[PDB]
Ligand binder design. Structure first.
Ligand SMILES: Cc1cc2nc3c(=O)[nH]c(=O)nc-3n(C[C@H](O)[C@H](O)[C@H](O)COP(=O)(O)OP(=O)(O)OC[C@H]3O[C@@H](n4cnc5c(N)ncnc54)[C@H](O)[C@@H]3O)c2cc1C
Ligand SMILES: Cc1cc2nc3c(=O)[nH]c(=O)nc-3n(C[C@H](O)[C@H](O)[C@H](O)COP(=O)(O)OP(=O)(O)OC[C@H]3O[C@@H](n4cnc5c(N)ncnc54)[C@H](O)[C@@H]3O)c2cc1C
Ligand SMILES: C[C@H](CCNCCCCN)NC(=O)c1ccccc1
Lengths: 497, 495
């Protein structure tokens, strides 16, 4: 009765999609891709807004373009058909502070130069160091400020740590939640902003039997039959038997398995239940919440000096002094505690001025946890949002040679026609943006348990199941190629005399 | 009669002696060939009494630089000014185009960074010249580079030539892109440093004008050395801090070459072989002392970009591979101030003094120094880049006032008074600037062989006997503290 399949992939993300791609590439037949949503791509979603303009509300860039297998693949096509599939939108960051204004590439602040030293500082703190406990990124930025106060001006000690935090937007975590040992990481080359990441999702989705894909099926349970087979159940009731299965649900969704309540959207009931080595890996790795807010304006009425703009939080000169007075490290850590609402200036905000990179009059901004859940929890209040960001929006426009902004959601002035927010933290099938490390996190743990699988037939792929390009789309891609290739290798023994 | 005999009065010998003395060791000799200490640390005076470090000038790796810490200590202590952090946003200038730094569309700095990462990868876990490498990158990534980026980038990234004192066709790629551990500290008089160390041990220990031309280790556990003129000396241990370049003459015929020390028996094979991994780097300097400051003080760091062509881009855009792009490169010399990248430190913004401290590289260094007496020629050679810098700095063409004629018309206009050039490549006690790598060198077998001395009596120190700060000032300083303590410990333990 239950349909016989060779390999059943759970999840139509880039990971499962690539698994499905590789499988068909290796002549594996009768396969099946089961996806809860009614769309493929998963955390690679391209939405539409005002005038029909499009933006990736999930991944946007191809990182490490020097080694990124997925990118080079995408680059090969464009190099052969001349079609624009991306664009290196790296630029010189423009740093704005509420009071001061633009403190970037400054002759007396030299902020970027001390950031690199701050970076190297961190590097010397870890990179090749056994034992060295962790501590938050915030703590680390404080330690540097303390161990080097003798060579930092009053303005550096104040404005530096704020610029330093643009990193929060790489990780999706606030500097107090972020693990230092993991804050600083190398980038293998420039970034390539994807001109339709969904453009990539589809290429891969059309590379294998279209009947393999069955959307809107939420997998409730996965069972390994003592007879060496895996049975998968969709909520709608359909049941399938398959020799192998490649599980690609988000680390967050997979985590729902180590708990009671089999009525949590997304959760899969595992029989036998996930190995103790897996669930326990969950303790040492966590989830981040990178969030996005697209600010669509009517026309490009602002300076395109750059495409990367970050607004620094707020700093106080009393801080400078505390750093100027602290006798020891703990004293500083202590003191500061001195004890209130969150506003657009309570954390760094990363704005991507698409008007220079894509010729579109919109701003793609990145937020981090905790602001993400908050902003996402109220994405439906387009007014409470415009109210929230108006100040930074104005401040930015001020520095970009333009007047304040005119809310025109429902003429040389900038008009905000529409606002789009991400829903990753609220999406039961997503539960966050992607993998991230908290202080004391051995991300190597999850990767190992994951890349090794539940057993011979219950495997794992996804941004968390791989090390190289972990958290990145291309990592999830490679993970898909991986698990499929292995399955493909095992099935190769089939045609042996 | 002497406990330790230190050969060389450089930063190495001076700390090596300082340390011995700080350890209570007596009867010591410091034998220098020159009439002064400091070695490659020499301060000189020019117009209106200004002082410039014609040799070392920066505190590198100020996060781990032991010496630098020591210096900041005193500063925190006695509030004096012993240095100024001058790392500034580099201003890149092309003859034709002008400034190209921090350009909204060229974004050279960003791609220069990919270039670095590209090199790092090219060598990560590997069993080629800096030029070969830039060409590889360009060919490999041309698909994601604009024509202008391809054109200028390579010329900009060559600022690295002034880190190694070598052109990008003679420098080893595997050693081009090292990494700096923290900001740099412009030493306000590196001589103030030479003097403090210098004064920390008994003055009557120094024997200036002693060209040690032979080191011998008598069987009966004694080390005896003789200086050119005559004076023979003997010691228990002997810290040889003469630079590599000179010590490399210890393996040739006509054993007389100035500064050439001849050991007996000779320097063991593990040492001789090390001199087969280049080290002929010649970084030179040329101070341009002006009347008064009258040019934009935007940045304290500037670099002129050797001319670049558009046919270069066309060739990169059309080459089918590393082989073709290689040959297609070459055609049809005349060396001008625009035949190489030039690094100008604008001392106006960092020190107040209306002067430019310029760094040059091999093979140019050798040329410009060999004509360091002809100020007229030196002015002609540099006038063009000097004017271009002035243009780009909200100023105007430089007036040659090296043979002065006070005139009012020189209101705003900048007036060049003096010009001071290094001589490192012609000084027999130097024979270049400092360690560098030719395509194929290996900065390890020399640092190790050297740090393992000849035997227990004959030790080596300097900027070519350590891995941390190798070739750098703090490196040598440390190599000297190293050889001393290692000896002061032995002597102490001897009952
Ligand atoms: C806001 C944001 C911005 C990002 N930006 C970048 C970037 O710029 N560059 C980059 O490289 N990466 C970026 N990433 C990360 C990148 O998007 C992910 O690493 C990648 O998309 C993960 O793909 P995946 O297949 O591993 O997981 P997913 O894309 O989440 O796919 C998992 C699939 O599982 C499905 N599913 C879950 N449970 C079930 C179930 N029980 N039954 C059936 N189906 C189920 C989900 O619907 C989903 O389709 C970003 C991520 C976010 C959230
Ligand atoms: C132009 C230039 C710029 C530089 N800038 C910097 C910088 O900014 N920052 C930095 O960290 N480093 C810099 N360096 C390198 C640094 O200055 C040197 O590595 C350092 O000075 C070496 O010190 P030393 O004691 O090891 O060698 P030396 O300074 O050469 O001392 C060795 C001594 O041995 C003497 N001697 C040689 N032969 C004999 C002999 N036969 N008998 C007796 N005595 C002899 C020599 O005269 C010399 O006095 C620069 C070098 C140059 C040339
Ligand atoms: C002392 C340093 C030379 C490089 N030293 C190499 C030793 C470090 C390798 N581990 N100075 C320079 O050439 C220089 C010149 C301009 C700006 C910065 C550095």
């Amino acid at each position: 009765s239950p349909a016989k399949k060779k390999v059943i992939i759970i999840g139509a993300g880039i990971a499962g999609l690539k698994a499905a791609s590789t499988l068909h590439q290796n002549g594996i037949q009768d396969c099946l891709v089961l996806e809860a949503r009614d769309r493929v791509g998963g955390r690679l979603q391209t939405v539409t807004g005002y005038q029909g303009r499009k933006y990736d509300i999930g991944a946007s860039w191809h990182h490490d373009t020097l080694t990124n297998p997925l990118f080079l693949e995408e680059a090969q096509l464009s190099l052969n058909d001349g079609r624009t599939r991306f664009v290196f939108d790296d630029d010189n960051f423009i740093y704005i502070d509420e009071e001061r204004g633009r403190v970037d590439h400054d002759k007396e602040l030299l902020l970027e130069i001390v950031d690199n030293e701050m970076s190297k500082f961190a590097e010397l703190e870890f990179h090749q160091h056994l034992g060295v406990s962790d501590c938050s990124f915030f703590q680390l930025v404080m330690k540097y400020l303390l161990q080097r106060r003798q060579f930092l001006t009053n303005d550096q000690i104040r404005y530096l740590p704020q610029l330093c935090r643009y990193l929060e937007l790489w990780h999706g975590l606030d500097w107090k939640l972020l693990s230092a040992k993991d804050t600083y990481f190398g980038h293998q080359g420039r970034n390539a902003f994807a001109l339709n990441y969904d453009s990539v999702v589809q290429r891969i989705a059309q590379s294998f039997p279209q009947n393999w894909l069955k959307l809107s099926c939420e997998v409730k349970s996965i069972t390994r039959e003592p007879s060496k087979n895996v049975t998968v159940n969709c909520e709608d009731g359909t049941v399938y038997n398959a020799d192998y299965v490649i599980i690609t649900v988000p680390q967050s969704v997979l985590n729902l398995s180590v708990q009671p309540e089999k009525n949590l959207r997304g959760r899969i009931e595992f029989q036998p239940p996930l190995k103790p080595v897996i669930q326990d890996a969950f303790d040492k790795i966590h989830f981040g919440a990178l969030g996005k807010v697209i600010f669509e304006f009517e026309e490009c009425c602002w300076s395109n000096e750059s495409s990367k703009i970050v607004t620094l939080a707020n700093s106080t000169n009393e801080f400078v002094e505390i750093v100027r007075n602290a006798e020891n490290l703990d004293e500083l850590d202590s003191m500061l505690e001195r004890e209130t609402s969150v506003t657009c200036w309570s954390q760094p905000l990363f704005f991507v001025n698409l008007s220079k990179s894509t010729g579109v009059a919109s701003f793609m901004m990145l937020m981090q946890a905790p602001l993400t859940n908050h902003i996402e929890s109220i994405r439906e209040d387009k007014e409470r949002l415009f109210s929230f960001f108006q100040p930074v929006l104005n401040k930015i426009m001020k520095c970009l040679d333009s007047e304040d902004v005119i809310d025109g959601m429902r003429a040389n002035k900038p008009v905000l026609r529409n606002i789009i927010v991400s829903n990753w933290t609220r999406d039961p099938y997503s539960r966050g943006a992607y993998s991230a490390c908290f202080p004391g996190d051995d991300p190597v743990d999850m990767v190992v348990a994951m890349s090794n699988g539940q057993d011979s037939r219950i495997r794992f792929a996804g941004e968390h199941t791989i090390m190289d390009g972990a958290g990145c789309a291309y990592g999830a891609w490679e993970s898909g190629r991986r698990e499929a290739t292995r399955i493909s290798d095992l099935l190769k023994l089939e045609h042996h005399h």
